[PDB]
Paper text:
Chalcone isomerase–like (CHIL) protein is a noncatalytic protein that enhances flavonoid content in green plants by serving as a metabolite binder and a rectifier of chalcone synthase (CHS). Rectification of CHS catalysis occurs through direct protein–protein interactions between CHIL and CHS, which alter CHS kinetics and product profiles, favoring naringenin chalcone (NC) production. The chalcone isomerase–like (CHIL) protein family is noncatalytic, yet it shares a “CHI fold” with CHI. The protein X-ray crystal structures of PpCHIL-A and VvCHIL reveal CHI-type α/β folds with high structural homology to each other.
Two CHILs are studied that represent distantly related species in the lineage of green plants: the lone CHIL from grape seed, Vitis vinifera (VvCHIL), and one of two known CHILs from the bryophyte, Physcomitrella patens (PpCHIL-A). PpCHIL-A and MtCHI-I have a high degree of structural similarity and align well to each other (C⍺-based RMS = 1.213 Å). This structural superposition reveals that PpCHIL-A contains a potential ligand-binding pocket that is analogous in some ways to the active site of MtCHI-I and complementary to the shape of naringenin, as it is oriented in the structure of MtCHI-I. Within the putative ligand-binding pocket, the tryptophan (W221 by VvCHIL numbering) is highly conserved across green plants with the notable exceptions of the two CHILs from P. patens, both of which possess a leucine in the same position (L188 by PpCHIL-A numbering). In summary, the structures of VvCHIL and PpCHIL-A suggest that PpCHIL-A may possess a binding pocket that is suitable to accommodate naringenin. This structural hypothesis is consistent with the observation that naringenin binding to PpCHIL-A has a stabilizing effect, which is similar to MsCHI-II. Supporting this idea, analysis of the VvCHIL-binding pocket reveals a pocket volume of 20.8 A3, whereas the volume of the PpCHIL-A–binding pocket is significantly larger, calculated to be 50.7 A3. The X-ray crystal structures of PpCHIL-A and VvCHIL were not available through the Protein Data Bank (PDB) prior to release of the AlphaFold predictions, and indeed, the PpCHIL-A X-ray crystal structure shows significant positional deviations when compared with the AlphaFold-predicted structure. A significant error in the AlphaFold model occurs in the β-hairpin motif abutting the ligand-binding site, which has significance in understanding protein–ligand interactions. The protein X-ray crystal structure of PpCHIL-A reveals a binding pocket that is analogous in some ways to the active site of MtCHI-I, and molecular dynamics simulations have revealed that the active-site architecture of MtCHI-I directs stereoselective ring closure of NC to form 2S-naringenin instead of 2R-naringenin.
Numbering used by the authors: 3 to 209
The structure:
């Protein structure tokens, strides 16, 4: 259709991020989590969008089982992440959170990924501090939208809006290519914080 339910939240099947020139299709969706004293709680609804052509860049995976694709060392993750097409994630907050803890968690997770790949130099460290600082003054209540748009492979346009509206302008830009790739790896990599979104995406490509 034109609208899909992700955790009873409406996600459009097609979407142009703020200030973008290109219509992106909904490839997969899922959720991310949080915990309180080991109890698992649903934190956000996620939708992963990309230029329709991403399907053709990944033709070679057609007809493989989804379970093959998401398995470690399959190679699919990196080819998904590196597909030379525009991509975006739309996040809809399910459990409200202050902006500092969210930005610090993001920083922590992106650092871990960059460190684990020997890519965490002073440039990446500064870019992450400034990303965390962007979020620190905001509150992210239930229903808030966060859009990350990979307009170029080395850049991420970050935009935010209240429930019911998409953002009109870009609020923040990530200018570091390694951070930009780490942010995609956060959602689509072997150690993804959202296995459900990755499983949804792989299904969509394999079929």
């Amino acid at each position: 259709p034109q609208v899909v339910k992700v955790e009873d939240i409406d996600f459009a099947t097609k979407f142009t991020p703020p200030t973008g020139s290109t219509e992106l299709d909904l490839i997969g969706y899922g959720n991310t989590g949080m915990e309180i004293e080991t109890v698992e709680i649903r934190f956000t609804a996620i939708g992963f969008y990309a230029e329709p052509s991403i399907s053709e860049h990944l033709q070679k995976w057609k007809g493989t089982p989804s379970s093959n694709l998401v398995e470690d060392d399959s190679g699919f993750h990196k080819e998904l992440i590196q597909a030379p097409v525009e991509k975006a994630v739309r996040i809809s907050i399910i459990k409200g959170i202050k902006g500092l803890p969210y930005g610090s968690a993001l920083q922590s997770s992106l650092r871990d990924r960059l460190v684990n790949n020997d890519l965490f130099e002073e440039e990446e460290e500064e870019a992450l501090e400034k990303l965390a600082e962007f979020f620190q003054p905001h509150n992210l209540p239930k229903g808030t939208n966060i859009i990350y748009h990979w307009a170029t492979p080395s850049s991420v346009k970050v935009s935010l809006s209240e429930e019911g509206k998409m953002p009109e302008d870009v609020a923040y830009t990530i200018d570091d290519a390694h951070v930009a790739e780490a942010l995609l790896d956060l959602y689509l990599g072997e150690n993804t914080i959202t296995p459900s979104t990755l499983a949804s995406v792989a299904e969509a490509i394999a079929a």
